[PDB]
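step 3/5: co-fold with calcium ion
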Amino acid sequence: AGTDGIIELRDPKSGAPLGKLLGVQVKSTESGQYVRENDNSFEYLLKPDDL
Amino acid sequence: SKRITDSQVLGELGETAIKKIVLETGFLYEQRGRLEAGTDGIIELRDPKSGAPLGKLLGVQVKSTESGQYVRENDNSFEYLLKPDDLKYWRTSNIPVIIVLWRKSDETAYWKDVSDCVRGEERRLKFDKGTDVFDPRSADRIGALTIDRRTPGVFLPPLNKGEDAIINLLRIRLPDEIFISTSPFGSGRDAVPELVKHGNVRFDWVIRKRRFVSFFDPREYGTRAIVDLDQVEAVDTKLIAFNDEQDDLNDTMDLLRRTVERQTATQLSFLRKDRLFHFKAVGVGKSRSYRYMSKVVSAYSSKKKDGWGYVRHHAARLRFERLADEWFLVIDPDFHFTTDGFQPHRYPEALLAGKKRLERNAAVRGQVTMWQHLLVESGKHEVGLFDADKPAPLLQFERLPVIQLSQAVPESSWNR
Amino acid sequence: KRITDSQVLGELGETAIKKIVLETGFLYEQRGRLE
Amino acid sequence: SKRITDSQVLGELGETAIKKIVLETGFLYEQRGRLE
Amino acid sequence: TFKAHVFDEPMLEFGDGGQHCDPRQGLREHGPLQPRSGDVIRVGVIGTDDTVAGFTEFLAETGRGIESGNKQLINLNPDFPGLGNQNPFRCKFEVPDGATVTISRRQVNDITGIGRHDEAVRHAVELISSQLSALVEGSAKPDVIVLALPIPLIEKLVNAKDMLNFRDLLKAKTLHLPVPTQIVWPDTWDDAAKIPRKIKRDSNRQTQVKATRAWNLLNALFYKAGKVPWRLLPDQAEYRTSFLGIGFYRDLDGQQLWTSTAQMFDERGRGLILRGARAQTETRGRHPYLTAKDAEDLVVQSIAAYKAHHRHVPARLVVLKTSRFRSEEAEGIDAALGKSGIEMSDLVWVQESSPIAIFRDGNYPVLRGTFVDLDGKGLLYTRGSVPFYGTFPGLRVPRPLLLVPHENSDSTILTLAKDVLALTKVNWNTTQFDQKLPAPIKAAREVGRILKHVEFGTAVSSDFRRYT
Amino acid sequence: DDTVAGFTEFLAETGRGIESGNKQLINLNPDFPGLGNQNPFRCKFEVPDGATVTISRRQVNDITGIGRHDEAVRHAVELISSQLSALVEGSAKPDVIVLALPIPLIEKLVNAKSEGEDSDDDVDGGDMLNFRDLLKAKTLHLPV
Amino acid sequence: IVLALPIPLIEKLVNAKSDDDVDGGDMLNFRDLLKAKTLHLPVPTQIVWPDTWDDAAKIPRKIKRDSNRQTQVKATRAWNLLNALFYKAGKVPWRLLPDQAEYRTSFLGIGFYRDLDGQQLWTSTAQMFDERGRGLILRGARAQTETRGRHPYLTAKDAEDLVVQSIAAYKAHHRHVPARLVVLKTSR
Amino acid sequence: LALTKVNWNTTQFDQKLPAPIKAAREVGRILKHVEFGTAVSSDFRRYT
Amino acid sequence: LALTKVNWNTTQFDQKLPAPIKAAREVGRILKHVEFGTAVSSDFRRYT
Amino acid sequence: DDTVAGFTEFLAETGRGIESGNKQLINLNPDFPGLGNQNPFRCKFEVP
DNA sequence: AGCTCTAAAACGACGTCTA
DNA sequence: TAGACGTCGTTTTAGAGCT
RNA sequence: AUUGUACACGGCCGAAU
DNA sequence: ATTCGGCCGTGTACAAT
Ligand SMILES: [Ca+2]
Ligand SMILES: [Ca+2]
Ligand SMILES: [Ca+2]
Ligand SMILES: [Ca+2]
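step 4/5: write tokens
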């Protein structure tokens, strides 16, 4: 699907799961170099269908 | 040793069973791992027309049961008590959460939004066995919870598998044989009074351009004085009925309507100023009822009221069209108003406008089915069941196959 | 993107089979995304 | 009232780390469900 | 048998590439397709002082926002966002100082004193048109002029105390003024005021909720200001097409029948030109069809209008008519196409009186956009249950459109139905997108009402701003 | 556009499977299985959008309006070759191109009878041009 | 298809040294002859010398027999070669960004080339126009006309038949004649 | 100037000649050896 | 007899003629209109 | 067989990325990215 | 300082009191 | 009869315990 | 006439007897 | 007169089950 995982919040003190979900998509690269990557910043181009 | 008790496998059986139900509905299920906190899965909506995942999620909690009865089960509804800790966790969620109950004994699944409290009791839900069933028929209802109805601009594409709709057409099975002749009479109207003196009135005949045509042989069951016997040579119906000439279309349509009138003459009266077929009223002030199939349904074809009153005969505008060299009949539901049931009413404005305003698609569709049942039955074999003085009807009407619609109206979700 | 009806059919079959194994008495473990 | 103790989170983290190590090796790892 | 199909709702464009299926919602998110230059749309008002002040506050009342008239259906009866960052037009409507013309009580009493309704209508038209000229020539210079008719005038001009129609006569007699007009009754901008009906004096006029009224009225004002609100989203690779709707209107005497045409085509870039025009030469007759010679001239004029904007003849020409295409019209149209070298052509008769219908189990009608092929004749449900609205917004039962293409049609009925269904969403006179008729067909009829009083040979503006 | 839409539906219809014409001889007249386990080619026959070229009614009337059959065939070949050239150099290049000839074009090119008075039927000549053979010969340079 | 010519074959075909006496100096060009003779094949072909995919390889020049040819750096060679390979595979890499309000235009370039006999002059033309949607068509055609001479210019009839052919090619994709037609020519 | 950036034979965009002019010359080199009257593909991929 | 079952123009395997004979006649129909000395593709998919 | 194997390695070599030939002018002489997310053609050049 | 049971959390239904 | 409270089953790690 | 639909009424047209 | 086809114009009810 569009997302690759769901992050659910949880209070680190009491351990109570807050129930708030958060979609996550993960792009994995192997020894790549992002577009216009300096030593402090870089860019990334999202696919139009993902938006 | 290690044991996997029947309770554990049953609990996993329910989660798999609900996933199977969701998947065949068309959505996507998302089983949560060991760290589930009260939601047994996540449901993502999908568009059945295009297959695109809609991206709207909702939590699922599944509570299985091998056998037994829920709280206050009465074969119509039951209740379920929610654990307070579960209810508190579900409230904090930013997505809707639905609880699904699965019973192994009768392999049934019921669903309900956890926020659908009954009688103000927050931790009690009241199911309904006739409308809370978990299955593909409820796809639109599930997706409706994923949006806030209070904010503008939120909507869901139709999620049902599809529907089936009637076409409001009746296929006409014409007899393969048509009786044509070059009658000496110049016009049809001129020959009408001449028929009365001779007798043997049938009135399924149309003559124009000095040429005669009918489905019945004029030599019997009808008069002969209007035609010359030598030139009466019977020919196949396909030669004139499906012939491209415009004049051959007009007489065929006129012949079809006049033929239809005799077949339904037992119950239908054909008005002339308005080309309207209306149910004839037996008894001046006696309302009628006609029964038709779908199931046994009795509709008040003739209805009368108090005061000076009127008689609301159910009416139709029967019209004939030719499609793909095959003749069809169109039913246009309408109403006819009469004071004593025989002569027309004089101010049917408020009655027609008042009556037509109220009915909806459900009522209009019922009238189409009623008329379709009547015309089909009116031409059936053995309708007279005598083989003499009542021959088999010439025209056979059969319902078209039901039209298949890919998308379906989310009518169930539109409850107010 | 899109999810073809054949793609969801495969998951329906695996879920149907997993359902069949469960009341048989055994245990079923659906494998990961890798085929 | 619902609580996810650090023990369960630590166990899940250990399982995830072992799966990550296995995938770094080049093998395939399948995680068993509730009925493990 | 008969094969069905349910078209998805065509997508619209609202500037900056904004795409949505709902005009009013699409305007909220992205704004108008063509952004208005400046930030204020100056609106002139003509009427009695109470009507002028009553409408002036209504424009301000829209700035603060109007609460949704039915919370159950906020997609069908949405709120008006107001002057915030969600302004549907990204502009504010003002009645600038000096842009107000007042009809005196003596002037109003002068109109109502005339016994003859037709004579009173003509006397009112020349009075109002004179006041229109003063507003245009003055330093105010509005963009759109609103005529707020007082209740006594409405009781006289519309109701009694064939006959002339005040709106059609007024629009025709002001076709020579640059600023478009807009008639508004007091019921629109004030819930307290009630106007009795014509035949039934006891009954009042039932109107939509104020939020819906503000959506439709201000959209018309914005369009009449000079900017196109929205447009059909163009496909990636489609033929450069021109749509020509042909309609007929009764003559003033009530016997003869003229031909009124409306043409819609995409402009170069972001735009949608809607042109209302009349046949240059009309042969006297009562015929609801066309002659081979005049049908040729209508196409030739249509091609020239398209060629003026694009500098190339259209690739495909779609002709929509209110009556069955006959052999004389088809061969007349073919002659004009051969002269201009148009490759493909469609000739569709948009019939609304067909008795064929479709019914489904349940209390709601079939979905909008459902199509069924009938031996090459299309049964399109341009109106029906709308999933976006959550209901079917209408009376008893929607009546489907029967599309009967001529034999000289290049495209299939499936493609034509999709185009016809899409054309129903570009009627800028309203924000509700479930219109029964396509815009070229509807605009042709609306043009005919105004042109009924315009004398033949008079040169009039082809802009649809003056007829909507 | 009638033939293009008609043939495109037929390709989808073969995907759903077609019942055998003669059940008595199920080997000589089998049934097309369609998509599934028994898909004969293990592939879907789809017509991608933008891979269709429509012959306008004026273009068909241009071919039918030519008196001599041999001239009409040659004119038709040049017309189809131009459309074929545009289809192979477009963005959506197909694997195989299907020429779904309309009924009027077949009548004029194969049956060689014109709606008006027929010229080449009156003057038979030594032989007659074959549209199919000439079209294949004149499109040998095209890659599809 | 990539034709990776070996070094000994390049020496014979290009440098012609392995040379015989010069006869007119109109030596055949292997690349142009190969491209022409395989125009009936359905797959485009690409010629690649060894020194582009291998920095160690060195082919001496034709006349300057003591010097190798100098080539661009390996990264630049990979950029140009793979872009050509992608284009010949059947897809357009990039296109000019079109202005929203622009006339539908068709570009027609006209050029001339010496005949194989070295005296006569033929006309070769190329046409550029963007198809409906995201695409760009570049056609290459020779004027189907018989007016042979040495003039580096067209005749009245020759140009008319050439422009008509270009318009018809445009009308095949757009189904409408272009709004603008820009003709670029190498001679006055 | 815009036409110089669509030659497709090189990734360096500072081309001197417009593409239609350049493409015409590239077609000419191949067509010297193609005898007149022979039908050939108009695709530029066969000449670049 | 074996060569009669490789006529890919049809799926009915009982064919009266071997494929080399059948294919040689099919290319004759197409090459009838091709001028001599003009290079044409030898692929049989262009002739079947 | 030397050039066929030699060019095939080059196609795979471009997949791994080629360092720029002149870092002083990184725009005139850029480095070929390879098969990462910066793949200029989003496809693999392979010899089957 | 090792084992070993023992706490502590979660989920899965299902008797049992407890009214 | 409903209805938490409970026992039973598992994982999960970590502690107080007897040693 | 903010907006259109549905219904009701009325007028008229095209082809042949 | 009929039988088939169709069209345009002015009013009310209603805001949608
Ligand atoms: Ca679970
Ligand atoms: Ca308006
Ligand atoms: Ca090159
Ligand atoms: Ca074949």
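step 5/5: annotate
The two ends of chain J are 15 Å apart (CA to CA).
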